[PDB]
Amino acid sequence: QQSPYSAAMAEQRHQEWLRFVDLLKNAYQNDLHLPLLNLMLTPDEREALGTRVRIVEELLRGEMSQRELKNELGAGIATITRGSNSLKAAPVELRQWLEEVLLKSD
Amino acid sequence: QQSPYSAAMAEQRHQEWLRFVDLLKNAYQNDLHLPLLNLMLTPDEREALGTRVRIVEELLRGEMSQRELKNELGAGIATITRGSNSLKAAPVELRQWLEEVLLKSD
Ligand SMILES: Cc1ccc2[nH]cc(C[C@H](N)C(=O)O)c2c1
Ligand SMILES: Cc1ccc2[nH]cc(C[C@H](N)C(=O)O)c2c1
Ligand SMILES: Cc1ccc2[nH]cc(C[C@H](N)C(=O)O)c2c1
Ligand SMILES: Cc1ccc2[nH]cc(C[C@H](N)C(=O)O)c2c1
Numbered sequence: 639q640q641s642p643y644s645a646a647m648a649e650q651r652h653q654e655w656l657r658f659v660d661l662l663k664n665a666y667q668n669d670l671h672l673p674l675l676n677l678m679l680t681p682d683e684r685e686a687l688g689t690r691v692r693i694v695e696e697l698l699r700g701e702m703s704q705r706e707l708k709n710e711l712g713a714g715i716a717t718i719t720r721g722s723n724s725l726k727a728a729p730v731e732l733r734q735w736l737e738e739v740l741l742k743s744d
Numbered sequence: 745q746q747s748p749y750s751a752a753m754a755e756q757r758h759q760e761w762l763r764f765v766d767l768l769k770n771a772y773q774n775d776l777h778l779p780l781l782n783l784m785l786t787p788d789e790r791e792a793l794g795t796r797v798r799i800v801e802e803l804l805r806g807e808m809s810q811r812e813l814k815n816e817l818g819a820g821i822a823t824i825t826r827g828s829n830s831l832k833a834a835p836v837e838l839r840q841w842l843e844e845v846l847l848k849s850d
């Protein structure tokens with residue numbers, strides 16, 4: 639098989655990913671997102687995404703310490719730091735939107 | 745830490761997952777789904793979801809052989825069979841919706 643690092647494989651994985659994104663958009667529009675995501679993801683993957691969202695929310699809120707976050711979520715420090723790095727790599731427009739969504743939800 | 749198999753951890757992972765699902769719904773509504781998903785997933789995870797969607801589409805279409813599907817997607821037979829099993833475990837309403845979405849897209 640080909641290298642996973644080739645441009646060709648990058649293009650293939652990029653186009654297939656966007657097909658998934660569009661199918662999930664349509665599932666949300668028809669209220670089928672939950673069964674689609676149970677089809678397309680494993681339990682561990684859904685668990686990881688739940689953990690990651692809580693890490694994002696608590697890092698942006700700034701109220702909990704890393705120690706408290708580790709205990710509350712059962713996620714190690716390395717995972718929390720990867721989440722902080724991932725936030726910093728994301729566009730400012732997304733980070734600000736997330737902050738605003740959280741602010742209003744209080 | 746607690747067992748990953750306890751009811752308590754199942755409930756925690758279930759509630760955190762649903763928080764992710766709702767945040768992603770809101771991202772789609774604001775056209776921020778692509779940056780949110782780049783934040784929340786790795787490249788390999790996006791690659792896997794693209795591969796899985798193509799497996800679903802080609803299994804439902806029934807036109808390609810498993811051999812052809814393996815070659816086209818660079819996914820082994822074990823992954824294709826896991827996809828077939830995953831389809832069969834999913835609700836009929838979802839499987840039929842996917843078939844109908846594909847039919848119309850032709
Ligand atoms: C053709 C090729 C050349 C370079 C490569 N770097 C990684 C891989 C994937 C895996 N190691 C394999 O051997 O398939 C690979 C493949
Ligand atoms: C089929 C394919 C496509 C994506 C992949 N991500 C990691 C791998 C394994 C590879 N041997 C490596 O670790 O570089 C790999 C292979
Ligand atoms: C959190 C998450 C989200 C969705 C995912 N799809 C695949 C994976 C990991 C898997 N072992 C792979 O990379 O093929 C994964 C993980
Ligand atoms: C919030 C958070 C917490 C831990 C995480 N582990 C992997 C990811 C995905 C990230 N976009 C990446 O490619 O590493 C991630 C995100």
Ligand SMILES: Cc1ccc2[nH]cc(C[C@H](N)C(=O)O)c2c1
Binds near residue numbers: 745746747748
């Ligand atoms: C408390 C407890 C009891 C039963 C368990 N089955 C799996 C685990 C997780 C891991 N093996 C660990 O040792 O944390 C675990 C933990």
Ligand SMILES: Cc1ccc2[nH]cc(C[C@H](N)C(=O)O)c2c1
Binds near residue numbers: 748
């Ligand atoms: C933190 C936590 C929560 C979810 C998990 N899925 C797998 C594991 C590893 C564990 N030792 C096992 O393989 O049963 C694990 C642990």
Ligand SMILES: Cc1ccc2[nH]cc(C[C@H](N)C(=O)O)c2c1
Binds near residue numbers: 678679799823828
């Ligand atoms: C279409 C397809 C192809 C291969 C796959 N590997 C893992 C999954 C997710 C599935 N819901 C599960 O829990 O195994 C999956 C889905």
